[PDB]
Amino acid sequence: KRITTPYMTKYERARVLGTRALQIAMCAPVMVELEGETDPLLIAMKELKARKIPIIIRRYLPDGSYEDWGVDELIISD
Amino acid sequence: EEDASQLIFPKEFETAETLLNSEVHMLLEHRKQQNESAEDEQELSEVFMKTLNYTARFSRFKNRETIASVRSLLLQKKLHKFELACLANLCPETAEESKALIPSLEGRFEDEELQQILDDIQTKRS
Amino acid sequence: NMLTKETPETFYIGKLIICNVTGIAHIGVKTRLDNGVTGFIPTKFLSDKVVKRPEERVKVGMTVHCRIMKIDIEKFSADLTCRTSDLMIAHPSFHNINFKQAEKMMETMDQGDVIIRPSSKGENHLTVTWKVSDGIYQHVDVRATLWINSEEFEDLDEIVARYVQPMASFARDLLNHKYYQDCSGGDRKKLEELLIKTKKEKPTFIPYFICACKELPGKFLLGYQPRGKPRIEYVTVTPEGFRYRGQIFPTVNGLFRWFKDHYQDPV
Amino acid sequence: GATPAYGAWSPSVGSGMTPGAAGFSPSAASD
Amino acid sequence: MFYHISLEHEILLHPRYFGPNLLNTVKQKLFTEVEGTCTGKYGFVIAVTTIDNIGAGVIQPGRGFVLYPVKYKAIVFRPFKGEVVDAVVTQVNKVGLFTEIGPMSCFISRHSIPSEMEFDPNSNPPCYKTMDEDIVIQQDDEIRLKIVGTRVDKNDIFAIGSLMDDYLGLV
DSSP states (O other): OOOSOSBOOHHHHHHHHHHHHHHHHTTOOOSSOOSSOOOHHHHHHHHHHHTOOOOEEEEEOSSSOEEEEETTTSBOOO | OOBGGGTOOOHHHHTOEEOOHHHHHHHHHHHHHHHHSSSSOOOOOHHHHHHHHHHGGGOSOOOHHHHHHHHHHHHTSSOOTHHHHHHHHHOOSSHHHHHHHOGGGTTTSOHHHHHHHHHHHHHHOO | OOSSOOOTTTSOTTSEEEEEOOOOSSSSEEEEETTSOEEEEOHHHHTOSSSSOOSSSSOSSSEEEEEEOOOBTTTTBOOEEOSHHHHOOOOOBOOOOOSTTGGGGTSSSOTTOEEEEEOSSSSSOEEEEEEOSSSOEEEEEEOOOOOOOSGGGTOOSSHHHHHTHHHHHHHHHHHTOSSBOOHHHHOTTHHHHHHHHHHTTOSSSOOOEEEEOSSSTTEEEEEEEEESEEEOOEEEEOSSSEEBTTBOOSSHHHHHHHHTTTTTSOO | OOSOOSTTSOOOOOOOOOOOOSOSOOOOOOO | OEEEEEEEEEEEEOGGGOSTTHHHHHHHHHHTTSSSOEETTTEEEEEEEEEEEOOOOEEOTTOSOEEEEEEEEEEEEOOOBTOEEEEEEEEEOSSEEEEEBTTBOOEEETTTSOTTSOOOOSSSSOOEEOSSOOSEEOSSOEEEEEOOBOOBSSSOBOOBOOOOSSSOSOO
């Protein structure tokens, strides 16, 4: 019974990319085969394109409730 | 102010679950049995060993069914939870000794009513 | 004992005593010991008498560990031995190795010889490689996410007998198939031309073939020609059996018997 | 690593249409 | 007295631990963090029996550490004043007696002990007897006592016993 938009806003996309990049930079396992790159931000972008980021977004509603959306669940804008 | 003699404890502890010596003994024994297996695991600490050798010297009964029966025959009464551990662990001989050790029993119940319970507890011992 | 504070009684034979060789008088290396004992290593300790002084056996300037076979602290002697020895079908092998060099010792053994070697991705991981075909090898990277417990680490004599041996037998069962081929590792570009070159000789009868890929081990290729258009259908070999169209068969012949009664549909 | 999971891949099945008649070989016994 | 209550705790997990064994690693970290410690609120904790659930890991902003507010079902030992237990005597000294209430050690002085139990320094094992020498109390004996006081020495409980009430000795 989720009523939030099924698209990923730019804000959420940016924050997810940044957080995944930070995690990768801290020696965390990747979720995609690396083609020979090292910049953690690029790896995060590749994972986002591949829809394998292990993060779920919790959109809080004004009333107080919230909805848990997974990155591999909603559509990515860019 | 915290004195178990007058049946007073903090709010958090009031909703606790009492444990008997045999019960904790078998729980720790099972935990040890589970931990010893599954190699590449951090071994027990001195705290576990001291607690084990401390509860093993006061195991009135090894059978779990004995624990179940002694808790079932006791919970039917109107005594508080605190009276379920000390009285089931010490196992006094006569009602006078139990009343002397625990001041709460003074005037809470009759003499024969408590003596019969103590005799039953003594018989339940292995 | 009063000055050095280290008598021969403390040092016993066989125990390894460090002899720090700091200098040599004529041939040997006479140095000081840990307890202030003049450790004189004779030529026998280094095996050099009328040749260059023993440098590899006795550390010159530093402390070199050797077997203590003489108590001569008071006599300014140290019988420390410079030599290391003085101080003292279904063939599952072992390996106490990288990936590129490991391939050089896989083409000699026949099918069924399983070998266990460490992994090269993380920690406390192992990879089980079993002979599949000529050049095809499945590198099951056990964390092929094969979930297992930790007690198996002590004894590794059943993981292959519970998940590799039956799978290996099932895979070998296909090797002896009547219509079997390789076509240089089963390339997608060479396995398609054969289907169109074999139909012209017998348009009525539609034979079939089986081959395993090389880039993705563990995925056989079961192709057929319903008409003048090729088609490909993969199949996975699970430890218990096979995985064709989602179903799992107990025996190898079950898949074959079930395949010859379902390819007639228009699809 | 250079040795990724091979058995975890999902085998995708190909679709199509072939309105053909029933004239192929029979089956066999499992024995 | 030993009890079984439900507690809660949170532990930060470094991102290097992400992977197929995430829950296992969180449990392993929980085991080696809340076993054997002590607190002035709930008391001394023995060990953990089972875990209820694993909360939703809220990744912190600008930091890779993620906290898991786990609620574990563990046991606890928080002795109170007035309780009566059965311990074992560890050592006998003229200054006082030493016992061992499981993870805690109490101490009773001669003043608490009646005048009937005198000293026996002449005998090799320190022991206390009476004039008639009928009753004997020594080390490694299941002797009862009463917890008349409590103390926590920075997560190290150390209560104090007493021997004034009757029926406190050999059962």
